[PDB]
Amino acid sequence: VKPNYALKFTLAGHTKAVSSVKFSPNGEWLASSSADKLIKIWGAYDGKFEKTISGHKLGISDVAWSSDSNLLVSASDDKTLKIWDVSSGKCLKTLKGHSNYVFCCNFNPQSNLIVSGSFDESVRIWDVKTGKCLKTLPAHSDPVSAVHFNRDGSLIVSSSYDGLCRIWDTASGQCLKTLIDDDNPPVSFVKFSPNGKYILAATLDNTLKLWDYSKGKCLKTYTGHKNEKYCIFANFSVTGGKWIVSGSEDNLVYIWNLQTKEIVQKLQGHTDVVISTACHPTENIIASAALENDKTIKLWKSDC
Numbered sequence: 001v002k003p004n005y006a007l008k009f010t011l012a013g014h015t016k017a018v019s020s021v022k023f024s025p026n027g028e029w030l031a032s033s034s035a036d037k038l039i040k041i042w043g044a045y046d047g048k049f050e051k052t053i054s055g056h057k058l059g060i061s062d063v064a065w066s067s068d069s070n071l072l073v074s075a076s077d078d079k080t081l082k083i084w085d086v087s088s089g090k091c092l093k094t095l096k097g098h099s100n101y102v103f104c105c106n107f108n109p110q111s112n113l114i115v116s117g118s119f120d121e122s123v124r125i126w127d128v129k130t131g132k133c134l135k136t137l138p139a140h141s142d143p144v145s146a147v148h149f150n151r152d153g154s155l156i157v158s159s160s161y162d163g164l165c166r167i168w169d170t171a172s173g174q175c176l177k178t179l180i181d182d183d184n185p186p187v188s189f190v191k192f193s194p195n196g197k198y199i200l201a202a203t204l205d206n207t208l209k210l211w212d213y214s215k216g217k218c219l220k221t222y223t224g225h226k227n228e229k230y231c232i233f234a235n236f237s238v239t240g241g242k243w244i245v246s247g248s249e250d251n252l253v254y255i256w257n258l259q260t261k262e263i264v265q266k267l268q269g270h271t272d273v274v275i276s277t278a279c280h281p282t283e284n285i286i287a288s289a290a291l292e293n294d295k296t297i298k299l300w301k302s303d304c
């Protein structure tokens with residue numbers, strides 16, 4: 001088993017670098033955020049442009065869906081997050097509190113909470129209904145590159161340019177684990193596995209690692225791509241074969257066999273750094289997006 005991802009659609013419309021793409025949990029939509037200050041919505045299967053959602057005053061670094069596919073949250077250089085009703089286009093809340101660029105965000109599975117990370121070195125936990133900041137965690141000593149909830153929402157993982165991945169108890173705000181690996185290269189991305197047993201972390205030394213975060217043991221290392229500057233998203237692909245998917249600074253999408261760590265496909269087509277990739281929740285579909293010199297989003301499909 002190798003996959004056979006092939007380009008199906010190219011989605012053009014952002015006028016500056018794309019920052020993040022994400023599929024809706026219900027599989028119907030792709031949301032994209034950009035340095036152009038906009039969120040765009042596209043059909044997940046046909047790439048058909050759906051709408052633009054606007055309101056942020058500066059570029060957006062991340063976007064994320066609620067569990068029911070009705071809301072988005074966005075993280076902006078304007079130091080706010082916004083909560084959006086996707087269908088109406090309304091900004092429901094503006095989450096204020098961070099003192100610098102907000103870089104990363106996610107809903108918990110219940111989607112009553114949002115987690116954010118910022119250049120202000122903090123992680124903040126927010127109440128979705130009221131927009132109030134519930135906790136400010138003194139999480140890191142450099143910008144926070146990623147934040148993610150585990151499968152039951154009881155944990156948060158954060159990554160930072162300080163070289164650390166930390167695991168937090170959602171309820172208490174307590175730091176439960178600090179993951180340490182040698183020379184402490186900036187951690188540019190992190191997320192939990194779908195099952196919540198592992199985390200996948202990217203570091204700016206051209207490396208992805210799969211950690212057992214409780215035991216604190218690096219289980220797999222994925223290499224061959226280029227990642228020394230940008231906070232590039234990585235993924236677990238679980239709809240067919242078990243893959244690791246990542247963007248890369250050589251303009252390619254990389255796909256590794258999770259177990260063997262071998263590169264199984266490289267997807268060519270983008271003309272600038274592939275900053276973001278996402279994997280469709282039920283079909284073997286990858287979305288990718290690129291930086292300023294490209295500005296397009298691509299939808300690729302495989303038989304496995």
Ligand SMILES: CNC(=N)NCCC[C@H](N)C(=O)O
Binds near residue numbers: 020060231233
């Ligand atoms: C968690 N978000 C993220 N990795 N976004 C992509 C990078 C956005 C950044 N503002 C940049 O242009 O490099």
